Design an enzyme around this catalytic site. Structure first.
Site, PDB file in Angstrom:
ATOM      1  N   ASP A 144       0.152 -21.010   2.369  1.00 44.37           N
ATOM      2  CA  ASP A 144       0.823 -22.066   3.148  1.00 44.37           C
ATOM      3  C   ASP A 144      -0.097 -23.015   3.879  1.00 44.37           C
ATOM      4  OD1 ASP A 144       3.456 -21.316   2.264  1.00 44.37           O
ATOM      5  OD2 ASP A 144       3.221 -19.584   3.571  1.00 44.37           O
ATOM      6  N   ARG A 164      18.524   2.426   0.428  1.00 45.09           N
ATOM      7  CA  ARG A 164      19.132   2.884   1.628  1.00 45.09           C
ATOM      8  C   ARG A 164      18.232   3.945   2.281  1.00 45.09           C
ATOM      9  NH1 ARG A 164      20.856   4.559   6.527  1.00 45.09           N
ATOM     10  NH2 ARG A 164      23.116   4.371   6.832  1.00 45.09           N
ATOM     11  N   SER A 182      11.200 -12.366   1.175  1.00 46.98           N
ATOM     12  CA  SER A 182      12.142 -12.944   0.238  1.00 46.98           C
ATOM     13  C   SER A 182      12.409 -12.009  -0.944  1.00 46.98           C
ATOM     14  CB  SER A 182      11.824 -14.372  -0.161  1.00 46.98           C
ATOM     15  OG  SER A 182      10.532 -14.460  -0.744  1.00 46.98           O
ATOM     16  N   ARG A 223      -4.386 -17.992  -3.932  1.00 46.94           N
ATOM     17  CA  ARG A 223      -3.491 -19.159  -4.059  1.00 46.94           C
ATOM     18  C   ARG A 223      -4.016 -20.344  -3.245  1.00 46.94           C
ATOM     19  NH1 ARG A 223       2.053 -16.371  -2.554  1.00 46.94           N
ATOM     20  NH2 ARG A 223       0.654 -15.684  -0.880  1.00 46.94           N
ATOM     21  N   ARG A 283      10.011 -19.368  -6.204  1.00 45.06           N
ATOM     22  CA  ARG A 283      10.223 -17.952  -5.990  1.00 45.06           C
ATOM     23  C   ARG A 283      11.348 -17.368  -6.815  1.00 45.06           C
ATOM     24  NH1 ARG A 283       7.457 -14.695  -2.333  1.00 45.06           N
ATOM     25  NH2 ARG A 283       5.778 -15.838  -3.424  1.00 45.06           N
TER      26      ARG A 283
HETATM   27  C1  LIG Z   1       1.538 -13.362   8.042  1.00 38.71           C
HETATM   28  C2  LIG Z   1       1.740 -12.544   9.346  1.00 38.71           C
HETATM   29  C3  LIG Z   1       3.208 -12.572   9.800  1.00 38.71           C
HETATM   30  C4  LIG Z   1       1.351 -11.102   9.078  1.00 38.71           C
HETATM   31  O1  LIG Z   1       1.906 -10.256  10.086  1.00 38.71           O
HETATM   32  P1  LIG Z   1       1.176  -8.832  10.418  1.00 38.71           P
HETATM   33  O2  LIG Z   1       0.875  -8.108   9.140  1.00 38.71           O
HETATM   34  O3  LIG Z   1       2.011  -8.227  11.490  1.00 38.71           O
HETATM   35  O4  LIG Z   1      -0.200  -9.453  11.023  1.00 38.71           O
HETATM   36  P2  LIG Z   1      -1.244  -8.520  11.844  1.00 38.71           P
HETATM   37  O5  LIG Z   1      -1.141  -7.051  11.607  1.00 38.71           O
HETATM   38  O6  LIG Z   1      -2.550  -9.191  11.646  1.00 38.71           O
HETATM   39  O7  LIG Z   1      -0.820  -8.783  13.371  1.00 38.71           O
HETATM   40  C5  LIG Z   1      -1.667  -8.273  14.380  1.00 38.71           C
HETATM   41  C6  LIG Z   1      -1.558  -9.182  15.579  1.00 38.71           C
HETATM   42  O8  LIG Z   1      -2.233 -10.429  15.254  1.00 38.71           O
HETATM   43  C7  LIG Z   1      -1.361 -11.507  15.472  1.00 38.71           C
HETATM   44  N1  LIG Z   1      -1.638 -12.570  14.535  1.00 38.71           N
HETATM   45  C8  LIG Z   1      -1.583 -12.376  13.185  1.00 38.71           C
HETATM   46  N2  LIG Z   1      -1.705 -13.511  12.505  1.00 38.71           N
HETATM   47  C9  LIG Z   1      -1.746 -14.511  13.491  1.00 38.71           C
HETATM   48  C10 LIG Z   1      -1.871 -15.929  13.443  1.00 38.71           C
HETATM   49  N3  LIG Z   1      -1.866 -16.646  12.327  1.00 38.71           N
HETATM   50  N4  LIG Z   1      -1.862 -16.612  14.619  1.00 38.71           N
HETATM   51  C11 LIG Z   1      -1.790 -15.912  15.756  1.00 38.71           C
HETATM   52  N5  LIG Z   1      -1.680 -14.596  15.926  1.00 38.71           N
HETATM   53  C12 LIG Z   1      -1.667 -13.942  14.742  1.00 38.71           C
HETATM   54  C13 LIG Z   1      -0.013 -10.896  15.125  1.00 38.71           C
HETATM   55  O9  LIG Z   1       1.038 -11.706  15.580  1.00 38.71           O
HETATM   56  C14 LIG Z   1      -0.129  -9.604  15.914  1.00 38.71           C
HETATM   57  O10 LIG Z   1      -0.001  -9.870  17.328  1.00 38.71           O
HETATM   58  P3  LIG Z   1       0.791  -8.852  18.293  1.00 38.71           P
HETATM   59  O11 LIG Z   1       0.060  -7.567  18.101  1.00 38.71           O
HETATM   60  O12 LIG Z   1       0.587  -9.307  19.702  1.00 38.71           O
HETATM   61  O13 LIG Z   1       2.156  -8.702  17.723  1.00 38.71           O
HETATM   62  C15 LIG Z   1       0.842 -13.074  10.452  1.00 38.71           C
HETATM   63  O14 LIG Z   1      -0.491 -13.194   9.956  1.00 38.71           O
HETATM   64  C16 LIG Z   1       1.302 -14.433  10.951  1.00 38.71           C
HETATM   65  O15 LIG Z   1       2.149 -14.523  11.856  1.00 38.71           O
HETATM   66  N6  LIG Z   1       0.704 -15.466  10.388  1.00 38.71           N
HETATM   67  C17 LIG Z   1       1.050 -16.841  10.744  1.00 38.71           C
HETATM   68  C18 LIG Z   1       2.332 -17.259  10.028  1.00 38.71           C
HETATM   69  C19 LIG Z   1       2.126 -17.555   8.525  1.00 38.71           C
HETATM   70  O16 LIG Z   1       1.142 -18.202   8.136  1.00 38.71           O
HETATM   71  N7  LIG Z   1       3.089 -17.082   7.694  1.00 38.71           N
HETATM   72  C20 LIG Z   1       3.059 -17.308   6.249  1.00 38.71           C
HETATM   73  C21 LIG Z   1       2.436 -16.117   5.511  1.00 38.71           C
HETATM   74  C22 LIG Z   1       2.505 -16.110   3.961  1.00 38.71           C
HETATM   75  C23 LIG Z   1       3.934 -16.273   3.451  1.00 38.71           C
HETATM   76  O17 LIG Z   1       4.815 -15.397   3.614  1.00 38.71           O
HETATM   77  N8  LIG Z   1       4.199 -17.423   2.797  1.00 38.71           N
HETATM   78  O18 LIG Z   1       5.435 -17.607   2.372  1.00 38.71           O
HETATM   79  O1  LIG Z   2       3.220 -11.397   0.408  1.00 37.02           O
HETATM   80  C1  LIG Z   2       3.799 -11.643   1.498  1.00 37.02           C
HETATM   81  O2  LIG Z   2       4.151 -10.807   2.341  1.00 37.02           O
HETATM   82  C2  LIG Z   2       4.106 -13.078   1.845  1.00 37.02           C
HETATM   83  C3  LIG Z   2       3.546 -14.053   0.840  1.00 37.02           C
HETATM   84  O3  LIG Z   2       2.385 -14.488   0.867  1.00 37.02           O
HETATM   85  C4  LIG Z   2       4.575 -14.476  -0.223  1.00 37.02           C
HETATM   86  O4  LIG Z   2       5.718 -13.975  -0.225  1.00 37.02           O
HETATM   87  O5  LIG Z   2       4.172 -15.360  -1.023  1.00 37.02           O
HETATM   88  O1  LIG Z   3      25.727   3.717   5.949  1.00 40.25           O
HETATM   89  C1  LIG Z   3      25.696   3.159   4.822  1.00 40.25           C
HETATM   90  O2  LIG Z   3      24.754   3.188   4.019  1.00 40.25           O
HETATM   91  C2  LIG Z   3      26.904   2.376   4.371  1.00 40.25           C
HETATM   92  C3  LIG Z   3      28.059   2.481   5.336  1.00 40.25           C
HETATM   93  O3  LIG Z   3      28.886   3.405   5.332  1.00 40.25           O
HETATM   94  C4  LIG Z   3      28.123   1.303   6.324  1.00 40.25           C
HETATM   95  O4  LIG Z   3      27.240   0.421   6.308  1.00 40.25           O
HETATM   96  O5  LIG Z   3      29.127   1.307   7.082  1.00 40.25           O
END
Ligand SMILES: CC(C)(COP(=O)(O)OP(=O)(O)OC[C@H]1O[C@@H](n2cnc3c(N)ncnc32)[C@H](O)[C@@H]1OP(=O)(O)O)[C@@H](O)C(=O)NCCC(=O)NCCCC(=O)NO
Ligand SMILES: O=C([O-])CC(=O)C(=O)O
Ligand SMILES: O=C([O-])CC(=O)C(=O)O
Ligand SMILES: CC(C)(COP(=O)(O)OP(=O)(O)OC[C@H]1O[C@@H](n2cnc3c(N)ncnc32)[C@H](O)[C@@H]1OP(=O)(O)O)[C@@H](O)C(=O)NCCC(=O)NCCCC(=O)NO
Lengths: 435, 435
Positions: free
Chosen positions: A373, A419, A242, A327, A399
């Site tokens: 969450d 970019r 976000s 949190r 946020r």
């Molecule tokens: C938060 C996420 C997206 C982080 O992603 P990333 O940094 O890629 O995690 P990672 O490096 O640990 O991933 C390694 C592997 O473990 C898996 N894994 C990670 N967290 C997992 C979970 N909660 N459940 C299952 N599998 C999970 C990943 O999907 C990934 O699998 P693949 O290699 O097969 O793709 C991940 O932990 C996730 O999917 N969590 C569950 C969703 C969630 O709770 N999201 C909210 C997070 C906070 C937030 O943004 N709040 O707004």
């Molecule tokens: O930090 C992150 O990537 C996601 C998270 O927990 C938030 O945006 O609050």
């Molecule tokens: O490439 C860029 O950064 C911008 C541009 O010309 C497009 O998105 O068409």
């Protein structure tokens, strides 16, 4: 006597100079390297943006202008008779880097109350939306539709010199934060309290309080939960989806309304802010499948089934954090004090003892610990806010505080268009030799 | 007999394997370094994403799956009796990497015609929007509002295994591309041809042609301009604002509707796709100030005044390109063939001889050459589409092609959440020593 705009007017030029000199001396200094795996991996581990308002430590969690959550709890001004920090004060801190006085805090509250107003076109739109249109989608469409009022968009079209951008961003930011709760609450009422009205803003209350009133909640503890919620969800450094989205979009000079709406589209992702909703739905199926008081072995089973079906366990894991999210802890402490005996809470507590272990056992997640969450919806449900598809909206409202505070700074500091260079697999293979 | 979905089903597993092995061997290979200035500079020069559909060369311009614009002009199937490439064919190429047959192209056209339909809630919303609400804002709100129909969002909520994401993304992508022109055209009519109707889709025409019909244009050359426009604006590698935004947002598993709408919010920035509109407004003031046939010295003057007022000269410069944009040249060639004597065209031509030099003289811009936006509106105006605030919508419609083609691939390849690390100025100073 209090005027954030005048404070910033003084702060801006000093920071400019400071960054100027720094870059003079270190612009060419390397802070890191890029590898093939980082590029394929959603930039994981790449130091890629400057974002001033908050910085996340993988072990210690988030710091807001250098202060930790507990520090904020302790330093920020509270409501009269309150215990939880007022989000207004957090905003002040993010923007100025300084802890505000209560007087300053009250000014923010008045300012937000003064600026709260919706144009009819927006009201009409919300009232015509179908009930099957997700709340976050309603929210993002409404914010986008508000851009007709943008003061920044207007000034830009007039040819304003680039050096004054911040000034107009600041205005739209304050206007947008002020309107948020009205939009959000109108959605809530239209969807769940059809035929009623959000009512009017009381220039004498804090922002959280006017919000809960518009939502229709009377419990005082709920008001307190809200203040906490809104404060802790405010910002989480710049690389989260976000925030990064608002940043990227604003970098092209889209107004704050458009930048914020795009951000909401990112917050609505299941891997991002939608998780708060997903956790509750997951818990509901759980309790439904197994029924209220489950055994650890059953919980394990249930977790495995999810993992085995190619799905994630919502509320656990993090792209940067490597330990339990402060949190989450902060929410736990709230529950412990206020609703220690709630069965859902108890379920949430039980999962903390189990989920991480299963995740560890599975061996995929880098961080097996819970994130914010995993604990938010449970608190909301307790007070009667059972509409889980609406939870992300609350997150979105919070946020706004962090991303809009940074947005002002990005334009003040003259950050250019974001970019980066992309590459194709084929091009990359060539760049190296290929594998 | 033709079915893109079946083609992709074969293609996917091979690419997976290929990337797998490559990473096996080179995942830890460094492709670049990050410096302080890159971080402060909107990642300029940072190799940060994998994006398969197109790759931009700073000197040579864009290549779509390895083909240059002229190559596409030459290879892609045209309309019967046509000269310009059908965007349908470009889509095929982006998605499969292969030049399609005319037969394949016609299937895409039918498919898009079949899937075109708007839900009433969306029609209602558009019809209730105020005329002072910018067309891009109307467009983004409408796309967001369409997410109620998302097949991907629906499947996700059902617990689909992650390996099938692509399949649902593909469906929504095809549905969304099909609906775009209906949305866009409804906006055009509501704003500029109040009381008329867009009419219906002719399953027998190409996408561009149905679009121009809904816009209400009869000139055949205009249809040809459209086909070209829509093809050349389709994609521009992954690091441009709109593309990067779709990428980032989709990475969190937001559906294509939400990802595409966020992108539009980025395209609407003055430093991005809004430039096409800005160029025309700039030209209008020009001609107004100086009047139709200006002297070079006067043009110079006018340019300087802009620069001296802290504004940019729209349509010139680029974050990556370092020479004249081939998209610009391609438009020039079109004008030369079709409206060589148009006074606005002539003005545009004159500026090409002057602007770059002034920019050079000013010494700030890295690339003093024109970009695509400097030449698009002029063509549109010639055919009677004088509504400059609507031009970006056209860009948006085109851009759907490239970003949605990549989006399918991102999910097919399992790209994770985009989440880089951010830093504060203070933290960074510490990391080094400070300056
Ligand atoms: C938060 C996420 C997206 C982080 O992603 P990333 O940094 O890629 O995690 P990672 O490096 O640990 O991933 C390694 C592997 O473990 C898996 N894994 C990670 N967290 C997992 C979970 N909660 N459940 C299952 N599998 C999970 C990943 O999907 C990934 O699998 P693949 O290699 O097969 O793709 C991940 O932990 C996730 O999917 N969590 C569950 C969703 C969630 O709770 N999201 C909210 C997070 C906070 C937030 O943004 N709040 O707004
Ligand atoms: O930090 C992150 O990537 C996601 C998270 O927990 C938030 O945006 O609050
Ligand atoms: O490439 C860029 O950064 C911008 C541009 O010309 C497009 O998105 O068409
Ligand atoms: C396209 C832009 C944003 C590239 O940004 P960036 O990579 O930062 O350009 P750069 O490195 O050359 O910038 C160096 C300096 O020259 C200035 N400069 C660059 N192009 C300029 C122009 N057209 N007019 C005036 N000043 C310009 C930059 O603003 C910058 O000034 P500051 O150092 O004082 O910030 C830039 O060239 C610009 O603002 N161009 C005018 C707007 C425009 O035509 N946008 C559409 C581009 C294509 C597109 O996305 N279409 O959709």
């Amino acid at each position: 006597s209090t005027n954030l705009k005048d404070v910033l007017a003084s702060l801006i030029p000093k920071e400019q100079a400071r960054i100027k000199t720094f870059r003079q001396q270190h612009g060419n200094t390397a802070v890191g390297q890029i590898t093939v795996d980082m590029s394929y991996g959603g930039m994981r581990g790449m130091k890629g943006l400057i974002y001033e308002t908050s910085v996340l430590d993988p072990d210690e969690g988030i710091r807001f202008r250098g202060f930790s959550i507990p520090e904020c709890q302790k330093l920020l001004p509270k409501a009269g008779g309150g215990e939880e920090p007022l989000p207004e004060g957090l905003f002040w801190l993010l923007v100025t880097g300084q802890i505000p006085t209560p007087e300053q805090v009250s000014w923010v509250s008045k300012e937000w109350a003064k600026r709260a107003a919706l144009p009819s076109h927006v009201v009409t739109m919300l009232d015509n939306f179908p009930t099957n249109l997700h709340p976050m989608s309603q929210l993002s469409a409404a914010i986008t539709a508000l851009n007709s009022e943008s003061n920044f968009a207007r000034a830009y079209a007039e040819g304003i010199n680039r050096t004054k951008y911040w000034e107009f961003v600041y205005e739209d930011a304050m206007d947008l934060i002020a309107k948020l709760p009205c939009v959000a609450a109108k959605i809530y009422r239209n969807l769940y309290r059809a035929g009623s009205s959000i009512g009017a803003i009381d220039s004498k209350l804090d922002w959280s309080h006017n919000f809960t009133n518009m939502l229709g909640y009377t419990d005082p503890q709920f008001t307190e939960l809200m203040r906490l919620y809104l404060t802790i969800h405010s910002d989480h450094e710049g690389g989260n989806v976000s925030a990064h989205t608002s940043h990227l979009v604003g970098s092209a000079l889209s107004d704050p309304y458009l930048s914020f709406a795009a951000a909401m589209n990112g917050l609505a992702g299941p891997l991002h802010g939608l998780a708060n909703q997903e956790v509750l739905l997951w818990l509901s199926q759980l309790q439904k499948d197994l029924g209220a008081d489950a055994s650890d072995e059953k919980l394990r089973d249930y977790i495995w089934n999810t993992l085995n079906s190619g799905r994630v366990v919502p509320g656990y894991g993090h792209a940067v954090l490597r330990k339990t999210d402060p949190r989450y802890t902060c929410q736990r402490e709230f529950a412990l004090k206020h609703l220690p005996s709630d069965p859902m809470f108890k379920l949430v507590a039980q999962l903390y003892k189990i989920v991480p272990n299963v995740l560890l056992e599975q061996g995929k997640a880098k961080n097996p610990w819970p994130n914010v969450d995993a604990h938010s919806g449970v608190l909301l449900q307790y007070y009667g806010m059972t509409e889980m598809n609406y939870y992300t909206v609350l997150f979105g409202v919070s946020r706004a505080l962090g991303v809009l505070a940074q947005l002002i700074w990005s334009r003040a500091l003259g950050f250019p268009l974001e970019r980066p260079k992309s590459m194709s697999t084929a091009g990359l293979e060539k760049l190296s030799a290929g594998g």
